[PDB]
């Protein structure tokens, strides 16, 4: 039963107190995307990649609510349920990188790079609202799937069209509504949707 | 491909024009329970069970939005995705019987009996909003699970405590938030929640 200590941030500013996790997110901050998570470890990577702006790559530069060390996309699975203090949360999707990040860091291809590396983080849906805190760690209570956030990112963005793999992703407990809609549409249309608008803003 | 004709009803009155299906349900009518489905076959059963009120047991007596013939809880699966006209919908849970039905039929134990038989029908979540109609059938496009609605009802209500079977249910694609919360809580608490308040008041 590993515990992952969490640094919390809301509208973005570090929080030390006890606070309330509602169905719609933490107080002061849709239901499938109420909580953003980014692995603190990835900052080291970005800093190496862009030395002359290493000072920009610290939490919560990527807009995250939860910052941790020891959880990454390859050891966190779709549908995973974690207890956090009094609340329950479930992994709903990988976070899709967005062009707005490029302007936030004033680096032209960050979003593209995030997507390519798969160092994107994940969003939660809140299964039970409750009292939470910075001093209360995450604890995995149910793993109900075999698809790691990493694999979900790969199915989404790295692989050529594979109906079988979309079927697999659609079978993942907790999958967000948008990702269900996106993947189902691929299966029916036979086409992978455009990423350009999301990634560049052009 | 097998496609299922459907009678629609919106709060209940039979609609047969086109109408818009939204994230929050049909136009005129939470996101996990936007669409209620009940199999038309069950009415025959209820009529036999309560002969002196057989006239009450016709669609949409059980409040359903969708009425069909050929789909039942043993051949519909958790997480199933169906195309309906222009929209996409996903099976999210068995419908939980409620005491209000007892007053609707003015028969004292209908909800309890529904739960016990497992003749409960199911709710959908709306994956894509779109134009729908009575003249547009349901078509199964993705089956992503091995838990039938029947099995989910049994895990819920018919079985003694079985952590393994709750794990199984928590692994079902599309499972509603409330059922996820309910089943997770069983696993942590070691206790099956009370049904009485829901079944009676």
Swiss-Prot record, chain A:
Top-level taxon: Bacteria
Record-linked Pfam families: MOSC, YiiM_3-alpha
GO CC annotation terms, alphabetical: cytosol
InterPro entries the UniProt entry points to: Benzoxazolinone_Detox_Enz (IPR052353), MoCF_Sase_C (IPR005302), Pyrv_Knase-like_insert_dom_sf (IPR011037), YiiM-like_3-alpha_domain (IPR005163)
Domain MOSC positions: 13-141
Oligomeric form and interacting partners: Monomer.
Protein name (Swiss-Prot/TrEMBL): Protein YiiM
Organism: Escherichia coli (strain K12)
Phylogenetic lineage: Bacteria, Pseudomonadati, Pseudomonadota, Gammaproteobacteria, Enterobacterales
């Amino acid at each position: 039963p590993m515990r992952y200590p969490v640094d919390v941030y809301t509208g973005k500013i570090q929080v030390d107190g006890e606070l309330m996790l509602t169905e719609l997110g933490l107080e002061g901050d849709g239901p499938d995307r109420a909580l953003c998570h980014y692995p603190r470890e990835h900052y080291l990577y970005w800093a190496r990649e862009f030395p002359e702006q290493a000072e920009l790559f610290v939490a919560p530069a990527f807009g995250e609510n939860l910052s941790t060390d020891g959880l990454t996309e390859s050891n966190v699975y779709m549908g995973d349920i974690f207890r956090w203090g009094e609340a329950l949360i479930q992994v709903s999707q990988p976070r899709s990188p967005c062009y707005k990040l490029n302007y936030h860091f004033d680096i032209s291809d960050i979003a593209q790079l995030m997507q390519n590396t798969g160092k994107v983080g994940w969003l939660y849906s809140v299964i039970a609202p409750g009292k939470v805190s910075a001093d209360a760690p995450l604890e995995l209570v149910s793993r109900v799937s075999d698809v790691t956030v990493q694999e979900a990112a790969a199915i989404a963005w790295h692989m050529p069209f594979d109906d079988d793999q979309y079927h697999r992703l659609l079978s993942a407990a907790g999958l967000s509504k948008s990702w269900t809609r996106t993947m189902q549409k691929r299966r029916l249309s036979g086409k992978i949707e455009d990423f350009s608008r999301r990634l560049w803003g052009k």
